Design a protein around this ligand. Sequence first.
Ligand SMILES: [Mg+2]
Ligand SMILES: [Mg+2]
Ligand SMILES: [Mg+2]
Lengths: 419, 419
Amino acid sequence: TEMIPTEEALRIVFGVSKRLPPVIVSLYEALGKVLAEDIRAPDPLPPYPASVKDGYAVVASDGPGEYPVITESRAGNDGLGVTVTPGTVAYVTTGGPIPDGADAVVQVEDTKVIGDVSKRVKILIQTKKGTDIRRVGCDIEKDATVLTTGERIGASEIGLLATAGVTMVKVYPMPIVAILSTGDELVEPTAGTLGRGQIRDSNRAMLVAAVMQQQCKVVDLGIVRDDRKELEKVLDEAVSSGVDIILTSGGVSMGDRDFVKPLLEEKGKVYFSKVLMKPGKPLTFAEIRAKPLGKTVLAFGLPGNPVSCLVCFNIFVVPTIRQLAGWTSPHPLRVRLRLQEPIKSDPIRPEFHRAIIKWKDNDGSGTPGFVAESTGHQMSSRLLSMRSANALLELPATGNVLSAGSSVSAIIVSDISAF
Amino acid sequence: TEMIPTEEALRIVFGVSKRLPPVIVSLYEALGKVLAEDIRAPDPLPPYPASVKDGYAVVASDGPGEYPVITESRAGNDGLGVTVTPGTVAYVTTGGPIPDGADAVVQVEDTKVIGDVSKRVKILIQTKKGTDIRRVGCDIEKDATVLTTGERIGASEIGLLATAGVTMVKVYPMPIVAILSTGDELVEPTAGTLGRGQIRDSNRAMLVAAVMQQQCKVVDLGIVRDDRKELEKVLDEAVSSGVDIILTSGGVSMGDRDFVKPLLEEKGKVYFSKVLMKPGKPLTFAEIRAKPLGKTVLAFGLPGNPVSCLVCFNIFVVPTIRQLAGWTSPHPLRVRLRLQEPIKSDPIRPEFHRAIIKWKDNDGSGTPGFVAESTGHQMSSRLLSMRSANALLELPATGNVLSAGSSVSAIIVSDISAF
Ligand SMILES: [Mg+2]
Ligand SMILES: [Mg+2]
Ligand SMILES: [Mg+2]
């Protein structure tokens, strides 16, 4: 067969893909990236006894009654005020330091201001010691590890970094990706009336947007014609430019002008060039060593057909991006769902059927789960099959018609928030 | 109770949130945004009879045998070459125009080159007319609508825009969001040794990263102290700056220095300020009209506690962002999952329990599905409960202990690709 299964091509790319060296970035540059160090709190949270509620800090043993407001301790006070002796209370807001001597905080809804212009308040409930008080370090202990290496940084992790005072973060960067399209029939997407035999370059803009969705820097190398020396020149510039991944579209098939596959066999080590899969078949993966520091560049000879180009990106390039970016779980999300319509599977090649999936309270069998609708015809040239497709149905090469209501595996390729 | 349920607060914000006027952006600026017009193909795809395979364009009636290669039609040729008469073939690559007279294409694996230096090839199979030929418009018909209004633009949609030659796209923009934190105890996250009663501002950096994850422009207004005139000045500048959403952290509780809620009642129309929910309770939503063009600004008085601040962002601000951005389905993804551990629900307030959910081939009952682990203590001040939390368990106010293995509803707040 010469071609390898998709599970083996993934294992080969996984074994070659190496995590990028960590870098130091600012707080907002660290969003979305994977932590490359442990984060320890230099001080506890809260660093002082803080009030949970707005109200009055009391002595729990005094109980209900009328007491003078001996002092006020709002959020922002230094806490070094008057000691709340038994028989006295202190007004506190949320986050306000608990004055020395207070054992609990009574909610302001459980109090009543007595008198007017010397202030006295009436505690209306009997509270126990420690009520509505955040002890020192109750949320975050001092020197405790709030964030560990390998953890991806989201919005909550950014707040934890700001809580610990970390504004320069050591993370694993995103790979720089160079993208180019091959084909003498390609013209820029700005072209109006097409010439004879000309089509607009769709893969390059598609791969650019796809790499952008992976939060990687894109190096647009433009349209390259089906010329051996030209493709060799662009690849040498791409390898020496400092990129980590090179994405090529087209030129890896069986035509006598497909120079992407041979050139990758010449400049680097091609691990495979054909994969048993639907859609498509040609897919060249090579490891190129930049000749100088010394650097390894991964090359993905993606097929020229728009569907196979984007599918091979979602299955092989996306995990390579995350693995280089330091993800501990680079694999995409895989779920089980029901089929909303009958689908005929290929008898030879396991198909990655494009589908629009959604969560239903009744997936067709009385239980909540995912259901998938087919996007239509699945030819590798019909980019409309990728339109609004958020999952890839992993159909096995059985040749049988999977009726509606059967369960298949699906690779989710984007957030499916469309309820 | 004075406070309204979460379903009603969402209905109020949904009824006030208005979609932003459409703008014209470039191709790469249109990524992630919602289409505000229909996209029609100015020319078919392919615009010419294109070969699917690399091989030879033949006359299907001639059948197998030896034939001369009368011409070559690779990808990039104008297609106005020599007519392939019966008894002749033409070499074609993938995307190459089909010469006039050819009815089918024979795969090069089904051919053999005969002779050498005049070229002759041997067709080894009997093919039917139309095999391995992309007819004009088979993938995309001319004047057909490839993209419709209200469709969010992903990588595949970008390729469709480049296919149709649309480099300037009419989309609905993202709202500009202004963010500020309130609190006399707040210091910048760059502060080292904290002073007495000081904590580092975590909500602002957290909300900035959260709004950035929504692909919105952030207007950082910084830390504002608990001063009535100061907060009034910052809000007047924020309303007149041109932002669409104002996010405030803190100053909406019961303390005598909480000026966010009263000021929003003064400059705009506050629709609610307390919500029946856990964590938290105070949450002020107001609509402010910018006094000049005329503009409506939505204000979210988020609570100061870090957990309640981020939770109220995920439930109320995120759909408001998407609704302003033109999303037809602004609601977050809601699924059903099993509990990996027993959880005690609040008897009064329905809780949004932070959880780390994952898809398992066996969710604990023999069927594949989602399972959720609790993040630990769910106090509104313990931001560690938000750490790596990707779902919000919608626990009902029943006071009963939901044992492990029971099914609850969950709001997914980020892509859960962690397999
Ligand atoms: Mg080609
Ligand atoms: Mg406050
Ligand atoms: Mg998801």
